[PDB]
Amino acid sequence: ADLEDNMETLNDNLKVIEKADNAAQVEKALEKMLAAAADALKATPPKLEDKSPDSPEMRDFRHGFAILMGQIHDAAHLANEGKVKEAQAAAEQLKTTCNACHQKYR
Amino acid sequence: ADLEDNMETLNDNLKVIEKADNAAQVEKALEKMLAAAADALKATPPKLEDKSPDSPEMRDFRHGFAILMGQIHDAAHLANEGKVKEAQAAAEQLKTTCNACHQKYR
Ligand code: HEM
Ligand code: HEM
Ligand SMILES: [Ca+2]
Ligand SMILES: [Zn+2]
Ligand SMILES: [Zn+2]
């Protein structure tokens, strides 16, 4: 999928996690975020279209996804342990990573 | 790219790391591995073609890539520190993760 569609998936899944009824639901929503983040890594965002594929900016963009995937991954483990409230808090905390990339590159 | 082309990227770059002359080369080879592992995550491997997209097998498969990406990430930071031998050793440890997935799903 393209960057916009993956971003939509990330957004929608945050809301799913916020309203989730149990740990199993939070876990699979986080797994879907992890996939969307991985699939997004390959993208060239509009703001960087004229930069080299290997520019510092493009490499920084890709790093943001590495970080996001790690954080989603850790949160998924909290849900796997049945810690629903903790997983939900960790999902909310992800927004701070979302924000950092957007302020730079969106 | 498809699953096999990404596997080829993983394999070629591991060889590059083994023969690399400086940290920057190692770091860039690792970044390309991390991208290939991210793109492979979406795949359905032939051995699991008949299972549910949400079967324990397919989730275990995607989890293999989450683990691999985290290890690749950590190794990239070692190279970023200029620690070439350490990053080479870390890249070598990656092979245990390659092998675990292959033994199950290859
Ligand atoms: C889970 C955290 C995140 C959420 C919830 C999120 C959400 C969104 C949403 C809803 C959009 C609007 C685009 C659309 O779908 O129409 C967007 C755009 C965008 N996001 Fe994110 N995002 C997240 C993380 C990130 C990260 C980590 C990066 C970079 C590493 C990033 C880069 C971008 C860029 C470049 C756009 C503009 C895309 C375009 O204009 O085509 N986002 N994001
Ligand atoms: C550690 C790094 C890895 C390396 C160096 C590597 C290398 C390879 C190579 C050389 C092939 C032959 C494919 C081709 O024709 O190009 C292959 C196939 C395959 N690998 Fe990996 N691999 C790695 C990690 C993984 C992981 C982590 C998984 C699962 C989580 C995985 C799952 C598979 C599967 C299912 C195939 C067979 C695909 C098919 O037959 O279409 N690999 N790998
Ligand atoms: Ca609910
Ligand atoms: Zn894990
Ligand atoms: Zn990092």
Swiss-Prot record, chains A, B:
Localization, UniProt: Periplasm
Gene Ontology annotations for the cellular component aspect, listed alphabetically: periplasmic space
This protein's record includes keyword Transport: yes
Cofactor note: Binds 1 heme b (iron(II)-protoporphyrin IX) group per molecule.
GO process terms (BP): electron transport chain
Region (Disordered): 38-60
Cofactor: heme b
Biased composition range(s): Basic and acidic residues: 47-60
GO molecular function, one term: heme binding
Residues annotated to bind heme b: M7, H102
Alphabetical keyword list: Electron transport, Heme, Iron, Metal-binding, Periplasm, Signal, Transport
Subunit annotation: Monomer.
Function: Electron-transport protein of unknown function.
UniProt similarity note: Belongs to the cytochrome b562 family.
Name assigned to this protein: Soluble cytochrome b562
First and last residues shown, out of full length: 23 to 128 of 128
